[PDB]
Each structure stands twice: as structure tokens, then as C-alpha cells.
Amino acid sequence: VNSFSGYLKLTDNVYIKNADIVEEAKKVKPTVVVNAANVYLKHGGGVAGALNKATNNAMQVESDDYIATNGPLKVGGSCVLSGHNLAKHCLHVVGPNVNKGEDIQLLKSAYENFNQHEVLLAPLLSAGIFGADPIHSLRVCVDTVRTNVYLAVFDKNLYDKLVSSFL
Numbered sequence: 001v002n003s004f005s006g007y008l009k010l011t012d013n014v015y016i017k018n019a020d021i022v023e024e025a026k027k028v029k030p031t032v033v034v035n036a037a038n039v040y041l042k043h044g045g046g047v048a049g050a051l052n053k054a055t056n057n058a059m060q061v062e063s064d065d066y067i068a069t070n071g072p073l074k075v076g077g078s079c080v081l082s083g084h085n086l087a088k089h090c091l092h093v094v095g096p097n098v099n100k101g102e103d104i105q106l107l108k109s110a111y112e113n114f115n116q117h118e119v120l121l122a123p124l125l126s127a128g129i130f131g132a133d134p135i136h137s138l139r140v141c142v143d144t145v146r147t148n149v150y151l152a153v154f155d156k157n158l159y160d161k162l163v164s165s166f167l
């Protein structure tokens with residue numbers, strides 16, 4: 001039993017809700033919140049900008065030190081950093097950004113990072129400003145993640161479309 005509330009169950013392990021991931025993280029304080037990161041951990045907009053804003057820019061400060069030490073992530077890769085006031089940990093995961101021409105096949109690799117964590121609060125990878133089809137992202141999520149994932153979808157219209165079209 002966990003503290004996530006109001007989710008629709010899609011499969012044995014995947015759950016979905018129309019919610020602002022920032023507000024959901026603040027309420028649940030999950031062990032792991034997933035960020036929709038880029039390889040430079042520049043949290044300017046989208047989910048990343050919102051999460052970073054909620055940490056009062058502490059996420060960005062920590063991220064800049066991470067990059068200075070380690071260099072950029074790989075597309076499809078991830079790193080574990082602090083969750084600040086939102087979660088114990090933040091798993092920064094880089095899905096391919098279609099608006100940069102990146103290979104959509106890397107979306108499966110990106111979701112594989114979730115399997116290293118028993119339970120996660122997450123957005124749909126490569127959705128929103130990353131330019132992929134969120135219906136496809138949900139399909140890859142369900143077919144790749146085996147651990148327990150609670151998906152927050154900000155847009156109510158998109159949420160209803162994802163549910164109603166789910167196979």
C-alpha cells in the first residue's frame with residue numbers, strides 16, 4: 001500500500017492521473033520523482049522548468065555542479081540527484097527530443113531507467129515540448145516499465161484522450 005490517490009489503473013504496474021506533477025510531488029513526497037531532463041540538465045521549461053521552479057532553483061544549482069563534474073548525460077540516460085522539497089530523489093531521465101531530431105527508438109531506453117526504482121512518480125517521457133506523441137509514449141511506458149509507475153498528465157484534455165484510446 002502506498003499514498004498515491006485518485007489514479008486510474010492501466011495495467012498491473014502502471015497508473016495514471018490528470019495532475020500537476022509539481023503539486024502531486026509536494027503532496028505525496030514520493031521516494032522518486034522523475035524529471036523530463038535534457039542532457040545538459042538545463043531545466044528551463046516544460047516539466048523540468050516547473051519542477052526546478054518549485055525547488056527555488058536549488059535543482060538547477062545542484063545540476064550545474066553535476067554537469068561540471070560529470071559532463072552531459074546521454075539521450076536515453078539518467079542520473080539520480082536530490083528530490084529537494086519535492087521527493088527523496090529526483091531521477092533525471094532524458095527522453096529523445098523530436099524537436100531536435102533525436103531517434104524516437106531511444107524512448108524505450110529512457111523508460112528502462114525507471115526499472116531501477118521500485119516506485120516512481122513520473123511524466124510521460126518525450127511528451128509536451130519534447131515533441132513526441134504522448135499516446136506512443138504511454139504505450140512504450142507500459143511495454144517497458146515493470147516497476148510501479150504513477151503517471152501525472154497535466155493537460156486534462158490529453159489525459160482523457162490517453163485513457164479513452166488505451167489498449
Ligand SMILES: CC(C)Oc1ccc(C(=O)Nc2ncnc3[nH]ccc23)c(Br)c1F
Nearest residue numbers: 020021047050127128134152153154155158
Ligand atoms: C501538445 C500538448 C498536449 O502536450 C502536452 C502538454 C502538457 C502536458 C502535461 O500535462 N505536462 C505536465 N505533466 C505533469 N506535470 C506537469 N507540470 C508542468 C507541466 C506538466 C503533456 Br504530458 C503534453 F504532452
